[PDB]
């Protein structure tokens, strides 16, 4: 189809011109104008929580686009998945894993 190849060309030109515009802005900024602590483990814990819950989020992303095809059985399975997710979240909050302040 002509429409899809036109849109592919437009998307390619969009990415190319955006990156080139930012590169040219940096080059013009460089060329113009004259010249002249230990991080706590809570950062790791928060990033780890983000990674784990983002994977469970991808499972829910795949479910959300095909809800009508899966029917009520898929609803029951996703309800079990979300209940396990929320039980893990409740466990994380109650044990002080998600409390930044001690």
């Amino acid at each position: 189809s002509t429409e899809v190849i036109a849109h592919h060309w437009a998307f390619a030109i969009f990415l190319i011109v955006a990156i080139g515009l930012c590169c040219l802005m940096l080059v013009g900024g460089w060329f113009l104008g004259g010249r002249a602590l230990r991080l706590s483990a809570k950062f790791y814990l928060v990033a780890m929580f983000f990674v784990i819950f983002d994977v469970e989020a991808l499972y829910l992303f795949a479910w959300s686009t095909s809800i009508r095809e899966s029917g009520w059985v898929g609803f029951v399975e996703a309800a079990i998945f979300i209940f396990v997710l929320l039980a893990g979240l409740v466990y994380l909050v109650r044990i002080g894993a998600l409390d930044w302040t001690p």
């Binding site: 060329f31 113009l32 104008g33 004259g34 010249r35 002249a36």
Partner: protein, 198 residues
């Protein structure tokens, strides 16, 4: 009449180079970002000028950077205490070209009323100053007047457009003094309002 830094020289100013210099000076004088630096009571009047009743944002001079790298103007608004003088010098050195300096108030001008053991007598003992504001404190509109004076001084200075081509010296305009400019209209004053009214 210009002053060179790399000397009392003349005007170096093709007609396209002059137009480019005018465009650069217009953009620089219409976008002046002061450094958020509080020394003493003069800073209170400066940030009063930043508020709604005066609205220094109208001149495009409100962005008020907390980092010296992003600031184009340093306002020494307060006393230059001897313990604060290395801090002031370090913050000025961290600024990038082009940079301008406004002394605000009698303390920053000369030490003011504090000719005392712990005060540097004026910030121009150690860093160069572009505009001086007398007052203790200068009112917010005096700071805005100094901002306009700095804009006039920026608008006809000469700096290199690029660091790879052309003269790299900085030419600063030798302005006529405001005292001699305003002497004609100031001496002609005869009567003022009596101080018994509002």
């Amino acid at each position: 009449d210009y002053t060179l830094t790399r000397e009392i020289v003349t005007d170096p100013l093709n007609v396209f180079m002059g137009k480019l210099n005018d465009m650069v000076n217009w953009g620089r004088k219409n976008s002046i970002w002061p450094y958020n630096f509080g020394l003493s009571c003069c800073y209170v009047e400066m940030v009063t000028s930043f508020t709604a009743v005066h609205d220094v944002a109208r001149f495009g001079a409100e962005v008020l950077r907390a980092s010296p790298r992003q600031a184009d103007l340093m306002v020494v608004a307060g006393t230059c205490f001897t313990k604060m003088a290395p801090v002031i010098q370090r913050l000025y050195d961290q600024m990038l070209e082009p940079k301008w300096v406004i002394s605000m108030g009698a303390c920053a001008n000369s030490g003011g009323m504090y000719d005392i053991y712990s005060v540097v007598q004026g910030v121009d003992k150690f860093i160069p100053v572009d505009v001086y504001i007398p007052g203790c404190p200068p009112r917010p509109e005096a700071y805005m007047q100094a901002l306009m004076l700095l804009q006039e001084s920026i608008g006809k200075e000469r700096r290199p457009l690029s660091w790879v081509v052309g003269d790299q010296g900085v030419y600063r305009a030798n302005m006529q003094s405001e005292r001699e400019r305003k002497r004609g209209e100031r001496i002609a004053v005869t009567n003022l309002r009596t101080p018994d009214e509002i």
